[PDB]
Design a protein around this ligand. Structure first.
Ligand code: K
Ligand code: K
Ligand code: K
Ligand code: K
Ligand code: K
Ligand code: K
Lengths: 426, 411
């Protein structure tokens, strides 16, 4: 990869943490699939296409359209997924107790605490196999019943990011919903990547990709409320959605919208409306992304890059402990992220622990994992080139530079070239 | 600028930590023992040729017309020479009064049982700003009567920015030490530069520096040199004395522990001390190049401590970066200078607190390199952009740019 020198200067300007480099300066950004954090060239053409569709259908943008695949009478736009989470949590009518979740996205956890809920109980998952994100149904039973009458809702994120985008099966989600329904506990989905999960289920069942909508509607129908970040599956530059069957929750969501107004802006809402309605292009984009994740995975695995096994929706997890086996690094993920970026121009991000305790309250052993995420619209050829460079890097015998942290957005410095007294101090 | 920023970040945002060979223009020191500039190899070859032609043995420093000492000893470095002198000292060990001598002396004196806690003040202004305050010297000699092992004077004193002491002042100092029977020791590492500055101030030709140097050296009972500042050699030191008892102890220790540095180096040192013509040429050029560097910096509006000086200029950070506040002004400005210009200076903290950067010029450097450096420094001073603030990460500190630190990490 050319231009190592400029990348080393970029690392130096950003505390040797490639996550802090501006997206537009990164050669191949795989830190996130969120279009809200990206400005790739294909995003402009997509906005133009959706704005044209909005004009042709006379979409107003006033409120979310009725959608054949979304079985909810009460639908609300938000500025982002995390704003949609805030709207739901603020509007929640019932008493505020625990929220049991399958290691939900970190934006949820702060919002839940701020709004008076207790998200300290994370639900464990299968952790291996074809549906590695399946909830452990016995542990779900234990938590629901431990905390009988003290659980506000169960929150399930499909294609769970904390579990590397592994899918949960429709059978598993129906089993979760039988348990919540039996107890009168609401089920809430974080459906940001539910279409990718629905596609993975169709594919594991030997079914055409176009069946994803049937499975998706089945999954959505199990929930009493859902939230979406729209910028992961729907090819839009930002935006969120809340939907519910619960009349009381809907009343409170509506009254808050009256106090504060609708978000995002009208032109953006017309584009979100077009995206939600135009199933053919959401289907196209999602199917290609999942397929290109699998192609990227295969190119990596056949090049000897060790990965957490799939299948997965939107990303692969590179296992640094296996990729750099004899290299004792003080901060393995941080050092390897900087090393990958310097050598290849590919930017990944750190993958945090799911935060699920063992039987005895202990923490599971530490994992050193890098997430490489694939946005809708990315070219397979770019990913195959990236996999080839990553495989060359893993095959290279040079030692990885051992970064020291200044006591995902931490700052580091190399210790190699400093005096012995200073380096020992640091 | 890109590659320099990467280099700065790999060395704790402290240009003093970068290896000398990786610095574009190194002005951190004039010492050849800390440098490997291209001209050094050719100089060594020329001196080795001279040693061969003259059949020098390297066994002892040669007799020199300007060095009035019968007892002369090589050492591995200036600081080793200081150690040899202090270890051999036969007299009772008490206070050493010094004119803010080089830091290697202070540690060596303490380790050898001497007390260097009393520094002698200097004039600070006037024709010779580094001249010793003679009334203060008298007070100190009377206050510490019978408890002073020696008075230590460093010419062209680095702590005072390389300003010269006059021959008249050194004679007045030595008359006072003689009157009390207290030996005078000189750190003569840059005595030749001091002698040249005195010839200039007296309207005398530069070739008279050897006569002034001999006049100065002849006042002292013992002298030490780091040879790598004035003699165009890659390392080495010299101790000399008139004192028979000190000489016997230096000799005894040399017989127990052996001569230093190695023989080949000692022959090159001997050739350098003997070949006055090239030392005169290099020292005269260096002092003149400092003066030219100074003038060009002045022409560009770069604020400097006034001269004339031997081996360096002191850049005044308080005047060069007036305006918004820096937690570590010298460190931030050193980083700023290096990033923008490729010039590496060093901190000068020698004696309300002054923020000064030392830009030192080794023998052999080209004037065109200095004039280019001054022009780049002039442009940097003319730049209105605020200097990036640095935060220290807990001498020779490591830093991180303050704006890059999250609020948690800062606290
Ligand atoms: K993101
Ligand atoms: K847009
Ligand atoms: K967002
Ligand atoms: K250089
Ligand atoms: K040399
Ligand atoms: K001679």
């Amino acid at each position: 990869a050319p231009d190592r020198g400029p990348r080393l200067a970029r690392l130096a300007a950003h505390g040797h943490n490639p996550v802090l480099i501006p997206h537009v300066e990164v050669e191949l950004d795989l830190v996130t699939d969120s279009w809200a954090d990206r400005a790739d060239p294909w995003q402009r053409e997509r906005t133009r296409a959706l704005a044209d569709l909005a004009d042709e259908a006379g979409l107003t943008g006033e409120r979310p359209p009725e959608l054949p695949w979304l079985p909810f009478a009460h639908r609300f736009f938000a500025a982002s997924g995390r704003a949609a989470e805030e709207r739901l949590c603020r509007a929640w009518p019932g008493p505020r107790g625990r929220v049991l979740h399958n290691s939900a996205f970190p934006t949820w956890l702060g919002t839940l605490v701020e709004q008076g809920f207790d998200p300290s109980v994370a639900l464990p998952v299968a952790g291996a196999g074809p549906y590695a994100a399946d909830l452990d149904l016995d542990a779900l039973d234990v938590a629901l019943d431990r905390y009988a009458d003290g659980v506000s809702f169960v929150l399930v994120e499909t294609a769970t990011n904390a579990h590397g985008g592994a899918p949960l099966s429709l059978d598993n989600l129906r089993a979760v919903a039988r348990r919540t329904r039996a107890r009168g506990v609401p089920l809430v989905l974080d459906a940001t990547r539910l279409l990718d999960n629905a596609l993975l289920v169709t594919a594991a069942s030997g079914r055409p990709a176009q069946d994803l909508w049937q499975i998706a509607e089945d999954m959505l129908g199990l929930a009493q409320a859902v939230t979406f970040s729209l910028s992961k599956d729907f090819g839009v530059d930002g935006g969120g959605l809340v939907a519910t069957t619960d009349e009381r929750l809907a009343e409170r969501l509506t009254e808050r919208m009256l106090e504060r107004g609708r978000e995002p802006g009208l032109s953006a809402r017309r584009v979100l409306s077009a995206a939600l309605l135009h199933q053919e292009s959401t289907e196209r984009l999602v199917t290609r992304r999942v397929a290109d994740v699998a192609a990227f995975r295969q190119r990596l695995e056949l090049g000897g890059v060790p990965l957490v096994p799939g299948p997965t929706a939107h990303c692969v997890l590179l296992d640094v402990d296996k990729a750099a086996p004899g290299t004792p690094l003080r901060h393995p993920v941080a050092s390897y992220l900087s090393w990958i970026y310097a050598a290849t121009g590919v930017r990944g991000g750190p993958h945090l622990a799911p935060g699920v305790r063992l039987t005895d309250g202990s923490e599971p052993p530490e994992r050193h994992l890098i997430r490489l995420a694939v946005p809708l619209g990315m070219e397979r050829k770019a990913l195959e080139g990236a996999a080839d460079r990553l495989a060359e890097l893993v095959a290279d015998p040079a030692p990885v530079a051992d970064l020291t942290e200044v006591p995902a957005l931490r700052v580091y410095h190399p210790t190699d070239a400093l005096p012995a007294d200073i380096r020992r101090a640091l």
